[PDB]
Design a protein around this ligand. Sequence first.
Ligand SMILES: Nc1ncnc2c1ncn2[C@@H]1O[C@H](COP(=O)(O)OP(=O)(O)O)[C@@H](O)[C@H]1O
Ligand SMILES: Nc1ncnc2c1ncn2[C@@H]1O[C@H](COP(=O)(O)OP(=O)(O)O)[C@@H](O)[C@H]1O
Ligand SMILES: Nc1ncnc2c1ncn2[C@@H]1O[C@H](COP(=O)(O)OP(=O)(O)O)[C@@H](O)[C@H]1O
Ligand SMILES: Nc1ncnc2c1ncn2[C@@H]1O[C@H](COP(=O)(O)OP(=O)(O)O)[C@@H](O)[C@H]1O
Ligand SMILES: Nc1ncnc2c1ncn2[C@@H]1O[C@H](COP(=O)(O)OP(=O)(O)O)[C@@H](O)[C@H]1O
Ligand SMILES: Nc1ncnc2c1ncn2[C@@H]1O[C@H](COP(=O)(O)OP(=O)(O)O)[C@@H](O)[C@H]1O
Ligand SMILES: [Mg+2]
Ligand SMILES: [Mg+2]
Ligand SMILES: [Mg+2]
Ligand SMILES: [Mg+2]
Ligand SMILES: [Mg+2]
Ligand SMILES: [Mg+2]
Lengths: 292, 290, 290, 289, 292, 293
Amino acid sequence: GPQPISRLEQCGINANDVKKLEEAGFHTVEAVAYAPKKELINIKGISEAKADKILAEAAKLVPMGFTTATEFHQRRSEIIQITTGSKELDKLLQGGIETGSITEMFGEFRTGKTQICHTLAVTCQLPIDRGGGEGKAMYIDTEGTFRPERLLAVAERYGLSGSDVLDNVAYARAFNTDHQTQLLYQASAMMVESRYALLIVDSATALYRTDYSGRGELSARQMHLARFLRMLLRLADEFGVAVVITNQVVGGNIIAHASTTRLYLRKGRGETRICKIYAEAMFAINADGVGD
Amino acid sequence: GPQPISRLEQCGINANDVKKLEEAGFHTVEAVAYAPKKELINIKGISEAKADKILAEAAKLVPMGFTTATEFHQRRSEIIQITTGSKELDKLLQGGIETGSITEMFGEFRTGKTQICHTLAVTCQLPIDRGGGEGKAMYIDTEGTFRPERLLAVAERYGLSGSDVLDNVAYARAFNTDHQTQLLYQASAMMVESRYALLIVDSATALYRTDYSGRGELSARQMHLARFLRMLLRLADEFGVAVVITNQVVNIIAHASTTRLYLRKGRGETRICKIYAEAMFAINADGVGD
Amino acid sequence: GPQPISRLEQCGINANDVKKLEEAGFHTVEAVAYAPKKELINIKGISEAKADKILAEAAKLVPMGFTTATEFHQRRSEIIQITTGSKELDKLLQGGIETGSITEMFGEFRTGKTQICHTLAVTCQLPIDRGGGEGKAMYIDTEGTFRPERLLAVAERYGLSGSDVLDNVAYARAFNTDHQTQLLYQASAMMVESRYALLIVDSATALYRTDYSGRGELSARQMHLARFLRMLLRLADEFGVAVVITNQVVNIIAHASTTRLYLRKGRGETRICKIYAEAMFAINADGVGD
Amino acid sequence: GPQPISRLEQCGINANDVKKLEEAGFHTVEAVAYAPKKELINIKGISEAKADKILAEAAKLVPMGFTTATEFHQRRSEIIQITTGSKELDKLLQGGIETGSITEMFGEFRTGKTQICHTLAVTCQLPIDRGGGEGKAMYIDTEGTFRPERLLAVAERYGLSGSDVLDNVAYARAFNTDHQTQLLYQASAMMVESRYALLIVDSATALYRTDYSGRGELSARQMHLARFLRMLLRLADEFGVAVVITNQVVIIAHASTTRLYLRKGRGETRICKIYAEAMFAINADGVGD
Amino acid sequence: GPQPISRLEQCGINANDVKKLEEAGFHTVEAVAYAPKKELINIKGISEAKADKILAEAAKLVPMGFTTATEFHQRRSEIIQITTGSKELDKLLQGGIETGSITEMFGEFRTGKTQICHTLAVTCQLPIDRGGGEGKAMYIDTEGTFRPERLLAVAERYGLSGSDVLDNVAYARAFNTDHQTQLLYQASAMMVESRYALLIVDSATALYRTDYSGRGELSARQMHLARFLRMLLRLADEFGVAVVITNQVVGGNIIAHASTTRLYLRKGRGETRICKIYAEAMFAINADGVGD
Amino acid sequence: GPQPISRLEQCGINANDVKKLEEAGFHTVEAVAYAPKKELINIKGISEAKADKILAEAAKLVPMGFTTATEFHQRRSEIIQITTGSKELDKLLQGGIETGSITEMFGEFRTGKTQICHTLAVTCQLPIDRGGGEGKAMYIDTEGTFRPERLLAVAERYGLSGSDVLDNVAYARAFNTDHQTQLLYQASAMMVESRYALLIVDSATALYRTDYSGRGELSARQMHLARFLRMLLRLADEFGVAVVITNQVVIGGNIIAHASTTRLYLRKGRGETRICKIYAEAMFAINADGVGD
Ligand SMILES: Nc1ncnc2c1ncn2[C@@H]1O[C@H](COP(=O)(O)OP(=O)(O)O)[C@@H](O)[C@H]1O
Ligand SMILES: Nc1ncnc2c1ncn2[C@@H]1O[C@H](COP(=O)(O)OP(=O)(O)O)[C@@H](O)[C@H]1O
Ligand SMILES: Nc1ncnc2c1ncn2[C@@H]1O[C@H](COP(=O)(O)OP(=O)(O)O)[C@@H](O)[C@H]1O
Ligand SMILES: Nc1ncnc2c1ncn2[C@@H]1O[C@H](COP(=O)(O)OP(=O)(O)O)[C@@H](O)[C@H]1O
Ligand SMILES: Nc1ncnc2c1ncn2[C@@H]1O[C@H](COP(=O)(O)OP(=O)(O)O)[C@@H](O)[C@H]1O
Ligand SMILES: Nc1ncnc2c1ncn2[C@@H]1O[C@H](COP(=O)(O)OP(=O)(O)O)[C@@H](O)[C@H]1O
Ligand SMILES: [Mg+2]
Ligand SMILES: [Mg+2]
Ligand SMILES: [Mg+2]
Ligand SMILES: [Mg+2]
Ligand SMILES: [Mg+2]
Ligand SMILES: [Mg+2]
């Protein structure tokens, strides 16, 4: 799928200019092509002639022209469409979470948004014919709640081995608003080496709340969240990873425009745990992930 | 050894600046690495270039990148699980107090939340095989209920030396709502000189309730207590220390407590403990175990 | 012991900022340290720079950090531990009333609660070796029952001079609810220059119930009583005075207490007490019996 | 500065040019000398050579060169130090309001800053021996709080004729923001005929808070107030007249040589901080108690 | 007295530039002179040179220079100082309400503020030698309480003819917040045309209270009220009318800086209707205006 | 004719916007003239220039400037002054209910406040010389007490044909709080469709008492009732229609005190002999044929 920068080297001065793109945040040739000229100019050590040469060579490897809608329909076909463990949720989402798009989640507290993230991180490693995209998840946590013991229980019901499933999953444990951004930098390098399917960013707004209490800092955090969200859209594009964002309610803001699908959750007086497409489906939290 | 900040000095670090970072609150290279660039700039006398250099070197002394989930699993199979006595009959906590995470406590009054804090303060200094933390406790009293005689009474139950239990506890009464905050700043300095396995706040809200009695304040009480809790998480993970908070019953103040523990008055001496599982725990003359 | 506020002066603008804090109630450097930035900046005439400076200088004088329990055990040892005049009652409180604690008292009426206060008032003057702390009483009366005739009568029982005994004791005779509040500020002013031991506030709640008119002020009355005891604990802790509260029966006055001495009744003259154990003591013309 | 622009006229000056320069705001040669080439070239009808010759003759009249520190100390020993009556009690300002400087005040409301301005307006007319300035004041009211009856009463306390106290005081209410600058220009014009000793602005920032309501014109207000303060500094420096500015507490930080903060005290007794304290009481006949 | 803009024509172009100032709000030459440059610039159709010419002609027309304090003292004399119908109030106010200054009023309800507004309106028509200033009142009502029969009764008490006292009094009946400002703009015309003495704004804060209930509109209503008060002060200074403002209590805030005097009222219980200069005085509402 | 809004459609009015204003709540040019620019802007689909033009054309068709007190006195000596019945003896209101101004009512229970509401609804139909309103009422029941049989009885007491007294009363029960506001919106058009002389609310606080019960809202009920009363004042002083509001007592000055220019508080006096005093005295009875004893 994705094509590394190493292919871009053609009189481009290897190992003196390729890394200047590597620490710039670009890790694939298509990432450079999908990057503006000004994004390459502001990088130190890249001249106007050299930046033009890189973009000219980048456009040669990846196609950025006009394609007919029939070609796009089949490209939008064969989408991985990883499952979610619940039959009703599977029917409601027309096959679960779709790759290449950010799927947000909402809730008040103890609504299962962290819980259904765990059952996704294991089901993304299932083969295509039985749901997920046989990849590896990249769970990122901010409010520390990652419990690998839960992955053992949910992997047991699907017949997967308990050892192999943990090797595929990657953990981040972000601590600051900025540290989330450099995690995506290390994410892009990791996406090239191995096939990945999920980019769970559980509690993607928890950090922004804790260290931006200043009333005059709203304009600062709005742009910071926009850059983080914008970097999520692109990262989903080259690699086709179903980015999942968990957010705290206590509906519609700068995070909404970037998002493709939302799955507002809350409890219920009866039968518990319904979902929305802010359509309703039935799901519940059992010992082994989600159930009916 | 959780990497003290003295190891960050280089030619450009200008170790006179280490004391400038030390007075800010960051006494650990993990603290500055986990500190955002925003609060490095807010420190007076630190420039944009200086802050970048501090963060750049702090990054290469601690693992700040990704890790495989199987590595994190065995890093969870190292929790101390400090013993408590009679509450963990059939192991409601599955081992004991969760180290590296706050364990908040509730109750109405005369329930026994303060009493097991005394027992927790003597258990954490027991050897690991018996259920201890092999480290010395830390008490931050807030209402003035600290009784060092109780520590001696429970010490003889486990056979530990009476003289060796009092010198281990680091007691500090909090007369103020802000005095709690800078006690934690003084705490991080003390956590690197020796090994502490338990931090206890006798009442995280007693002075917040009485000092902030104004009708208008309300909101001001929130982010002040939020900063108190956000530092408790900061001390919890870069030292691997168990934090116990007791509160009086009858962002938010409910997102930081990894574990909760509500308490009830049963029939007579039969104390009741519940989690928001229930167990029989008592308050004997020599501790909590029945 | 307590350090007078005048020592705080080091470029601190004498008689203009020290005097400004004098009417604020902060008459010792301990009071300044034990007070937040809030009411130091709420005092008119103090800016943010001055408030920070006076707090910084106050911190350097009194210790505010962490101390080992061994230091606190000795500190909580050698307490004055004022006697109560009754040997059976003496051992039941393992030494009688203890300083630094708001020892409340209960009853119905004619229960001896005022009687033992007068006995406790004469005995605060005794030397360490046989009871009291060689200090002066600071009786505060609301429901007028202070009869100095009793003090001279009990003085000859213990063999003390009947003239110097009344010279040491103070007398307030509070009238209004706001009057009780401002006496405590004046109490701290006169506290510094003399060794004081006892702070009887006899009938500390019967004055408020006089002002209790209608149901539309219960919220305000509790808040006023909240900071009345808050000052008392803020006054006993950093001056080491044995505050005694005498309430009448049939987070208010329940949390701030340290000991209670319910005074049920008996067989007419067989007065007894609780620690809400029983102690046998008689009430006669010369104070109360042993 | 008893050195008028009239004496600048010469054979080559073409004294009609003096009148033409007067409208620019310059009425003393000390004003043109202290003004750069920029402030003279922008005046219509003045050529480069004319400005050069004007500045050369101004330099030949007033000296701008260096001076020994002893002479500077001696000339700063000749400060009038207009008295107040209760603020100066216990020698808070070591004499009172000093001439040649801006003495900005503060206050929340009813703190007494207007009343002490009234007291100063009559104390400046005292003979220098008693603590006055031997010059007529100048009141620039903005919020309409001027009351000559209070001036007459306070003059009665100090024992002066009421008619001579009032007719010396000059009054002018300012309605517009630019009206304040025009009033300062007229003040510079009229400062040369008679010896003045005090300039009172009742509330310099009052008109800026109401004329410049919103729509983000903050920068305009900022440099307009900067120009006002620079004009006042130039006036005080060239004429040696004490300048007093009051401000309303809910720029003016670099020009306030002495800064005062008035805040409510106990009853009629009030406290005054030098942003260091004193008891000033506002009586029925002034401030001195 | 006040001088109309029609005298401003010296190559000022009548019916094309004078009318622009008239529709902008200014109706007298001193209104233009007491107005800043930008208040003339922001009006469409007036250039910088035209504004300079208008300001210069106004400045030579009216005197905006320095005046000796003796002249201002004699100008503080001959103030109309209209009476109020109560000898106690007459002595307390040192002659009653004074022209050129807003006299605010406070009260809970049924305190007599509208009643004494009515007696002021009737008594402002008296000749100089016996109280009022032989002018015309302009009672502006927001919460409809204007009762002309009360004016008839009180005028009969004072001996004035009942026909003329109605002929001189003017009524507004404001409905909206902007309607008050438009009413003052229209009131400037009657200021120019005829001699006027009173500008009652009875319940000047009732409309602002009733149509600004939104918690997010406090800044807007404060700015509107500030503009309204500044307009009242400029009108009073221009024409020397005794503006009286009636306010509803249920202490002090931004409104007193523009105000000159306040007459806080209270019920009084025994003998009732006691007032302050927030010094005290006692008045009584008879069937005929105010009395003892 | 209180100037219906349909006359405001000029070349620049875009008569679809006229219907937009009509559904907004304003049905007369007087309503939009007495309307601040703020709420016209908040009407979704009206631009700043369009709102300016609407206000400008509203201003030049209705008088909004100053008027001499003689003109206002003449415009006040034309109140319709609807009669009441038995209270005709010793006129306390100097003729009866004041037109164009709310006449609030009180009483504990069983007093008869609803009965004289029926009598007012029938007397609004009497000719002017007889003391009526020459119009049709609007009873808005909020407690389910409206009974057309009493209307028939009182109509035959004054000798009016029943079919002519029934066809004019516009009954509308309220099940809700916002239903009252919607009813006022609908009544705004009914005012211009035909002449109306009285508006009656059976209990303006009955629904507010039962729909809002929690301690939480309180202020919500407060400004909801404030908006209700403001709408009532606007309709009354725009359309020249008397408004009568009855309330449940068990009391004095509150939000509805400022809005009601007049009161009439009723007591269960000596049996059949009821007593009414304004917040004077008048004794009236409630017979089978209405009020007149
Ligand atoms: N093994 C399990 N069996 C049944 N229910 C569970 C299990 N684990 C968790 N739950 C329930 O699922 C919920 C998960 O909440 P969570 O999603 O972590 O909260 P948040 O959305 O605030 O992060 C808990 O409230 C818990 O009651
Ligand atoms: N020696 C003892 N024997 C039995 N019970 C005790 C003994 N000492 C203390 N307790 C009990 O332990 C409890 C401790 O209460 P504590 O937790 O300190 O109250 P708080 O929660 O208000 O701090 C008391 O209610 C008391 O009944
Ligand atoms: N000299 C005495 N002889 C005998 N009995 C006494 C003497 N003095 C006091 N008493 C008894 O002690 C009681 C004192 O009442 P007291 O408890 O002081 O009232 P309060 O309830 O206000 O404290 C009286 O009931 C009295 O019977
Ligand atoms: N004759 C007097 N006797 C006592 N106090 C007075 C007298 N006249 C004025 N004052 C006091 O002087 C103060 C004047 O306030 P002022 O400085 O005019 O307010 P502002 O600073 O807003 O202009 C008033 O608060 C008043 O209390
Ligand atoms: N003819 C009269 N005789 C005596 N008193 C009257 C007469 N008319 C009105 N009043 C009294 O004067 C007061 C006027 O109140 P008013 O000031 O109009 O209320 P608000 O302050 O709400 O406008 C009423 O309380 C009334 O009692
Ligand atoms: N024919 C009649 N004779 C005597 N009394 C009657 C007659 N008809 C009605 N009433 C009285 O009129 C009263 C009307 O009460 P009403 O005002 O409807 O109560 P509410 O105030 O709850 O609406 C009743 O209490 C009833 O006693
Ligand atoms: Mg969750
Ligand atoms: Mg307890
Ligand atoms: Mg007693
Ligand atoms: Mg003042
Ligand atoms: Mg009134
Ligand atoms: Mg009834």
